[PDB]
Design a protein around this ligand. Structure first.
Ligand SMILES: NS(=O)(=O)c1c(F)c(F)c(SCCO)c(F)c1NC1CCCCCCC1
Ligand SMILES: [Zn+2]
Length: 258
């Protein structure tokens, strides 16, 4: 609607329209690495992206999102903390105005320049809209971005952003391989949480990778040239589209490693 990221419509306002914003399993959170307990019962994640079919990229006025065909079992996530199979629906990012900010999760209070979310839904619920109504409906793979060397697998995304500068713009984006956005290691933390944007539904198993990816200053600059506004309204750069850390409450963050 009118929710967004500014002073008058940002995260501190969302609770008026979405009261679960003050719920018991909200995301993101700070990852206290000394308190997260290694769980030797967790499994390696299985990330099977070999058959992914990207379709389109879209400026939705909050972020940009790369969508996939999830009408069968092509790109799927399973294992780790998950039971059953989760299909990849879309990925999007959160980023800052300055490199010292932009991530939603934090690690010992450290903020990363950006955070990538690969959003998957549990096939036992048949469609994403049903899955949003279930505590185990979605699995989101979160990957930190730091600024350093370019990520070559990101360049195709960055090069299309000028064709989707404003809200409501989209572009075919076929043949994109999300495998090129992953770091080497799949070591992760996991905890039960929520969407980080309205409706803030408490339906997500979070899987946050420990190893960040590096992206170049030029790449992240291109994110920051996007607009929150649509073609013809005052220009508002799309930056600082992150929700800060929420109370952990009665949750445990588990580590897959160490
Ligand atoms: N971080 S996240 O996964 O919760 C998320 C955002 F933070 C976003 F800012 C966005 S962009 C605008 C939301 O409509 C997003 F699509 C998602 N993805 C989902 C939320 C919207 C509901 C539709 C389908 C689930 C994906
Ligand atoms: Zn997100």
């Amino acid at each position: 609607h009118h929710w967004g990221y500014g002073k008058h419509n940002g995260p501190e306002h969302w609770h008026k329209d979405f009261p679960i914003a003050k719920g018991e399993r909200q995301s993101p959170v700070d990852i206290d690495t000394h308190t997260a307990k290694y769980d030797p019962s967790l499994k390696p994640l299985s990330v099977s992206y070999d058959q992914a079919t990207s379709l389109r990229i879209l400026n939705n006025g909050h972020s940009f999102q790369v969508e996939f065909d999830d009408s069968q079992d092509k790109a799927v996530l399973k294992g780790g903390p998950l039971d059953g199979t989760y299909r990849l629906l879309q990925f999007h990012f959160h980023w800052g105005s300055l490199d010292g900010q932009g991530s939603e999760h934090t690690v010992d209070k450290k903020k990363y320049a950006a955070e990538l979310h690969l959003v998957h839904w549990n096939t036992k619920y048949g469609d994403v809209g049903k899955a949003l109504q279930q505590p185990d409906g979605l699995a989101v793979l979160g990957i930190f971005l730091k600024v350093g060397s370019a990520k070559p697998g990101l360049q195709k995304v960055v090069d299309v952003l000028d064709s989707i500068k404003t809200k409501g713009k989209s572009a075919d984006f076929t043949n994109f391989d999300p495998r090129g956005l992953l770091p080497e290691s799949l070591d992760y933390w996991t905890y039960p949480g929520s969407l980080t944007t309205p409706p803030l539904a408490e339906c997500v198993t979070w899987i946050v990778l420990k190893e960040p990816i590096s992206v170049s200053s030029e790449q992240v600059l291109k994110f920051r040239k996007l607009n929150f506004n649509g073609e013809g309204e005052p220009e508002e750069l799309m930056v600082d589209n992150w929700r800060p850390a929420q109370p952990l409450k009665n949750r445990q963050i588990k580590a897959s490693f160490k």
